[PDB]
Scaffold this active site. Structure first.
Site, PDB file in Angstrom:
ATOM      1  CG  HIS A 152      -2.173  -0.872   0.999  1.00 64.92           C
ATOM      2  ND1 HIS A 152      -2.233  -2.157   1.496  1.00 64.92           N
ATOM      3  CD2 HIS A 152      -3.335  -0.667   0.334  1.00 64.92           C
ATOM      4  CE1 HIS A 152      -3.390  -2.699   1.155  1.00 64.92           C
ATOM      5  NE2 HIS A 152      -4.075  -1.819   0.448  1.00 64.92           N
TER       6      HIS A 152
ATOM      7  CG  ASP B 112      -9.636 -11.554  -6.618  1.00 59.49           C
ATOM      8  OD1 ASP B 112      -9.664 -12.285  -5.586  1.00 59.49           O
ATOM      9  OD2 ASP B 112     -10.657 -11.378  -7.361  1.00 59.49           O
ATOM     10  CB  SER B 113      -7.663  -8.649  -2.443  1.00 60.39           C
ATOM     11  OG  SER B 113      -8.733  -8.026  -3.097  1.00 60.39           O
TER      12      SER B 113
END
Ligand SMILES: CCCCCCCCCCCCOS(=O)(=O)O
Ligand SMILES: CCCCCCCCCCCCOS(=O)(=O)O
Ligand SMILES: CCCCCCCCCCCCOS(=O)(=O)O
Ligand SMILES: CCCCCCCCCCCCOS(=O)(=O)O
Ligand SMILES: CCCCCCCCCCCCOS(=O)(=O)O
Ligand SMILES: CCCCCCCCCCCCOS(=O)(=O)O
Ligand SMILES: [Li+]
Length: 155
Positions: free
Chosen positions: A34, A69-70
């Site tokens: 992030h 993916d997440s």
């Protein structure tokens, strides 16, 4: 710049990468992080593409990749990538780039309906080995994340 002109040049640059490609690439998802720590998830997947370095020294690629993916669901994507490239050091094999990708992806969240993709790209590499990344914009849960892959050029 003019949009008719821009479009034709973009379309042209895509068609030349498909018709007159120079190399293949292997894409290996590497790391996500992030942008606004108060990061290091490692996505599983892979992809393949065509690419070329143009007369200006700039990168073009056509690719197809899939990664988890997440929510740990497969996420396919295919598209075009371009980078403005610099080779600033005495050894010309070092390359740095900045550009964008346009393409289509699909996710389980929305029943794999295709979604258009327009995102920024950056890279650093030596010769055929490159660490390349995108940034997914968003303020709150949406994005503010970097996703990077190794790209191995061959043939
Ligand atoms: C392994 C890569 C897969 C990438 C996605 C598919 C690219 C489709 C063709 C683009 C060129 C358009 O074709 S052209 O006929 O106009 O030149
Ligand atoms: C919408 C699908 C996009 C293509 C993804 C590739 C599927 C290969 C099957 C692996 C199943 C799961 O295998 S695992 O390695 O994840 O355990
Ligand atoms: C030259 C190779 C370029 C690869 C680009 C990979 C982008 C993956 C994310 C797609 C948008 C996902 O949007 S999301 O908000 O739904 O996560
Ligand atoms: C992963 C990071 C990507 C950074 C991209 C920005 C690169 C700008 C480099 C200028 C080169 C120096 O100038 S030069 O004209 O001598 O080539
Ligand atoms: C024609 C080369 C000029 C260099 C500019 C490239 C900067 C990156 C473009 C969008 C980044 C998101
Ligand atoms: C051209 C000869 C054959 C290629 C082998 C080069 C190996 C490079 C490994 C490091 C890349 C690391 O990326 S870096 O540019 O930041 O160092
Ligand atoms: Li080649």
């Amino acid at each position: 710049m003019n949009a008719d002109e821009w479009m034709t040049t973009f379309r042209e640059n895509i068609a030349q990468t498909w018709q007159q490609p120079e190399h293949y690439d292997l894409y290996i998802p590497a790391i996500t992080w992030h942008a606004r720590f108060a990061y290091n998830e490692r996505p599983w997947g892979g992809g393949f593409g065509l690419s070329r370095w143009d007369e200006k020294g700039n990168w073009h690629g056509l690719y197809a990749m899939a990664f988890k993916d997440s929510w740990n669901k497969w996420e396919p994507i295919a598209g075009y990538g371009w980078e403005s490239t610099w080779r600033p050091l005495a050894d010309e094999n070092f390359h740095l780039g900045l550009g964008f990708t346009a393409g289509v992806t699909a996710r389980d969240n929305w029943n794999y309906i295709p979604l258009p993709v327009l995102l920024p790209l950056a890279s650093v590499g030596y010769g055929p080995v490159t660490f390349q990344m995108t940034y997914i914009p968003g303020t709150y849960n949406n994005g503010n994340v970097y996703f990077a892959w190794m790209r191995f050029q061959f043939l």
